[PDB]
Design a binder for this molecule. Structure first.
Ligand code: FES
Length: 94
């Protein structure tokens, strides 16, 4: 699994997330209550920003190329591919 450090507005929490599990799902199951709505990669509710490490969000559709190049991620459809750090609650920053 990968260590995913969620940098939330109320501090950091590092969870383990298997390669085959979406970050939001692992976070929810670890007891975090992160924003979401569609869970299909088609909105901005679950947006985060990758500060370090890599994800695979090939499933996503809402973010544009520039947003992804600036590290935004739709956590509901993102798998980790390394140990990573994701700032949560980033929809207003998009
Ligand atoms: S909850 Fe809509 S894209 Fe993730």
């Amino acid at each position: 699994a990968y260590k995913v450090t969620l940098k939330t507005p109320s501090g950091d929490k590092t969870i383990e997330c298997p390669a085959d599990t979406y970050i939001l799902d692992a976070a929810e199951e670890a007891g975090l209550d992160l924003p979401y709505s569609c869970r299909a990669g088609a909105c901005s509710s679950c947006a985060g920003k990758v500060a370090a490490g890599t994800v695979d969000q090939s499933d996503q559709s809402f973010l544009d190329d520039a947003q992804m190049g600036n590290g935004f991620v739709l956590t509901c459809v993102a798998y980790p591919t390394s140990d990573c750090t994701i700032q949560t609650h980033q929809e207003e920053a998009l």
